[PDB]
């Protein structure tokens, strides 16, 4: 542990699109592109000029994050995970990933419009 402070583009995805997202130390997670409830945007540009996407996790958890374009890939099927692991977990986390994959595979059978109506997060 060393304190770092001691030293001191086209839109590819729309709301409802199925994606793979890499957030923190989580593995590639099945997600849906959605609009941020506060910002009312699904995509934005960094102070460095890079594109970012707001994604909601397929899980039993209401997980959401603003992910960099390099960590957002198209979801074509659950077997695509092996390709993502080739490019490069707790029991409770593996169970929520399996629940995620189960619903993402169901969402692939639906249209983008249908995915929004069934899986968009409830905000209060």
Domain boundaries of the chain, sorted by first residue: 1-124
107: part of which helix (H) or strand (E)? Answer: helix 91-107
Distance CA 63, CA 96 (A): 11
Residues 6+ apart with CB under 8 A from 45: 9, 51, 52
Contact 73, 102 (CB under 8 A): no
* The residue to which tokens 């629940």 are assigned: 99
Length of the chain: 124
Q: Please, which residues bridge with residue 30 across strands?
A: 20
Q: Give residue 84's Cα distance to chain centre.
A: 14
SS3 state of residue 62:
coil
Q: In degrees rounded to 5, what are phi and psi of residue 119?
A: -115, -10
Distance CA 21, CA 31 (A): 6
Resolution (angstroms) stands at: 2.8
* The residue to which tokens 């039993």 are assigned: 60
Instruction: List strand residue ranges (DSSP E) for the chain, in order.
Output: 18-21, 29-33, 43-45, 51-57, 64-68, 72-74
What is the number of other CB atoms lying within 10 angstroms of the CB of residue 88?
7
* The residue to which tokens 């609009």 are assigned: 35
What DSSP designation does 6 have?
G
């Amino acid at each position: 542990p060393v304190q770092p402070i001691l030293s001191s583009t086209g839109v590819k995805f729309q709301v409802g699109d199925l994606v793979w997202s890499k957030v923190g130390t989580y593995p590639w997670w099945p997600c849906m592109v959605s609009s941020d409830p506060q910002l009312e945007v699904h995509t934005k540009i960094n102070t460095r000029g890079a594109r970012e996407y707001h994604v909601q996790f397929f899980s039993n958890q209401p997980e959401r994050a603003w992910v960099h374009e390099k960590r957002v890939r198209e979801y074509k099927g659950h077997k695509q995970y092996e390709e993502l692991l080739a490019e490069a977990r707790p029991q409770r986390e593996r169970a929520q990933w399996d629940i995620g994959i189960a619903h993402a595979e169901k969402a692939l059978k639906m249209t983008r419009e249908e995915r929004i109506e069934q899986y968009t997060f409830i905000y209060i």
